[PDB]
Structure 1
Amino acid sequence: KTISFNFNQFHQNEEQLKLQRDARISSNSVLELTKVVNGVPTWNSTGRALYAKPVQVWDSTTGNVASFETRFSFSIRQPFPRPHPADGLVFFIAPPNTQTGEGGGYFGIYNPLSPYPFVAVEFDTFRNTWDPQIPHIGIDVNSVISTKTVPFTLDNGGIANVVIKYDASTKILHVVLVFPSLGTIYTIADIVDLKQVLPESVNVGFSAATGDPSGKQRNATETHDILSWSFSASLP
């Protein structure tokens, strides 16, 4: 069984996407996860975008787990350097029919009141108490306290290409981050047993958030745009 989709760009009312909270598609075809008014990103924003159809990551009958590969391009523009941009964006896999969780450093995927399991790859731009220096790429399993982390230098407003690959036979999740304009390459990998943390059917998508009001800083913001996205999964 193989499932795959490709998005060279994004259109309004796209039927294959499920937009939640502040997420929306601009007229020039970009998926803006967090609020941007008149070219200016705002604080207190959270938004998600899920693929409309659930994907089967493993089968309880055969015990087999799926392998998958997803590539996407994003752009983070940080117009206000002081005091600190926030919060970042993530690619995540979660049970279907979930709802946006808490914003801020929780990226909109974690809900303390009723936590659901999830695997996520974060591009964290704000250093919370539980964080190492930012920006960093992090692999999260059921929590935003990354199992593995790697730092990177953001190309402010530039385009970033990401490749996430998961091999079921080795349980290796490897992610590659490239900034073509700068020619920089960052890589991180870890062992994650999907079958052990997630249910057979899941949703895949993105989530992001800007500074939470509790921080009392309106400058704690930045854009979180997704320019393209392709996904592929194979369940033998």
Structure 2
Amino acid sequence: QDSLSFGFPTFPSDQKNLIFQGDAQIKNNAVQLTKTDSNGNPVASTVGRILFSAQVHLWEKSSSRVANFQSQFSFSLKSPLSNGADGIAFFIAPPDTTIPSGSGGGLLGLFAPGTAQNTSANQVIAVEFDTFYAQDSNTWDPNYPHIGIDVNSIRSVKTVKWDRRDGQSLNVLVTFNPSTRNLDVVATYSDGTRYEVSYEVDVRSVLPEWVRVGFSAASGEQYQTHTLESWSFTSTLLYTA
């Protein structure tokens, strides 16, 4: 299809079009990307991801068209600790993507350790909400919580300082304009606190024509819940300037 859209105001338990990988599962009409115990508390060493089953036509070589897409979603992070880790990410990748070996912790379940910072060895665009930055294990991170745009590398090509708020839902809008090639990210807490970051990227030279979109989260030795509460996505192929 030239255009595709779907909306999940909430996440009832009987899903049919979601691919669950790792420890992701539905609980209380929301997706718990990372594992939790009996009483609902976050645990260490856990990775989880979800992907919508239908493939998205990001760009078409023959018509020379590129998709204009928009992803809106909201998540909350909760942890008994004040050092919640490691973060959640919205990503776009080849249709057959799977959790790479040893991609837990700071790799957010998106990259393999050996190639985490090798751009020519990956095919993924992700918007990360990173809450852990210890310079010993996450040597690639700026020294503070942040929102980052990741293009084939765990080391963001662009970031903005971010504030983690326990149990507070963050509303996020991600838009890609094929006409300007700008990937814009706008995140806001209910009180109006706003965060913005954008980067120019030619999705055609990064990803195949058909892809899958989803979310990933992980927790290494430090933990927190990564709760996806709602998600809408729309994509339309367009002839650009």
- Shorter-chain TM-score: which interval? over 0.9
**1:133–1:151 contact (8 Å) kept in structure 2:** no
Q: Name the structure 1 match of 2:123.
A: 117
Is 2:71 the partner of 1:73? no
1:35 maps to 35
Q: Assess if the C-alpha contact under 8 Å between 2:41 and 2:79 holds in 1.
A: no
**Which residue of structure 2 lines up, in the alignment, with residue 224 of structure 1?**
226
Task: Give per-residue Cα distances to partners, 1:6-35, cap 9 Å, x unaligned.
Answer: 001112240111111100001x20100000
Contact map agreement 2:34 2:48 (CA 8 A) in 1:
yes
Alpha-carbon separation, structure 2, partners of 1:79 and 1:67 = 40
The aligned amino acid for 2:164 is L
Structure 1 regions of 5+ residues with no counterpart?
212-216
CA change 1:47–1:173 in 2 (3 A) is same
- After TM superposition, the structure 1 = structure 2 runs for residues 125-204 of structure 1, keeping only pairs within 5 Å, are 125-127=131-133, 128-180=138-190, 182-204=191-213
Per-residue CA deviations over 1:145-187 (Å, capped at 9, x if unaligned) read 000000111221111100000000000000001000x320011
- Asked if the contact 1:135–1:151 (Cα under 8 Å) also holds between the matched residues in 2, the reply is yes
Cα distance in 2 between the residues matched to 1:204 and 1:177: 19
Amino acid paired to 2:123: P
Of all paired residues, the percent bearing the same amino acid is: 45
Once residues 199 and 206 of structure 1 are traced to their aligned partners in structure 2, the CA distance between those partners, rounded to angstroms, is: 19
Instruction: Measure how far apart 1:85 and its partner are.
Output: 2.1
What are the ranges of 5 or more consecutive residues in structure 2 without an aligned counterpart?
116-120
- SS of match in other structure, 2:65: coil
The TM-score, its normalising length taken from structure 2, stands at: 0.90
- Rounded to whole Å, the distance in 1 between the matches of 2:144 and 2:210 is 33
Aligned length: 225
Correspondence for 1:233: 235
Q: CA deviation at 1:56?
A: 0.6
After TM superposition, the structure 1 = structure 2 runs for residues 42-81 of structure 1, keeping only pairs within 5 Å, are 42-81=43-82
- Name the CA distance, whole Å, in 2 between partners of 1:112 and 1:44: 15
Q: Give the match's secondary structure for 2:225.
A: coil
Q: In the aligned structure 2, how far is the partner of 1:206 from the partner of 1:32?
A: 11
1:194-218 Cα shifts (integer Å, max 9, x gaps): 001000000000000001xxxxx4x
**Moved segments of 4+, more than 2 Å:** 111-116
Give the letter aligned to residue 162 of structure 2.
F
Query: What SS does the aligned partner of 1:53 have?
Result: coil
Task: Indicate if the aligned counterparts of 1:94 and 1:116 stay in contact, CA closer than 8 A.
Answer: no
Q: Output the CA distance in 1 between the equivalents of 2:35 and 2:213.
A: 21
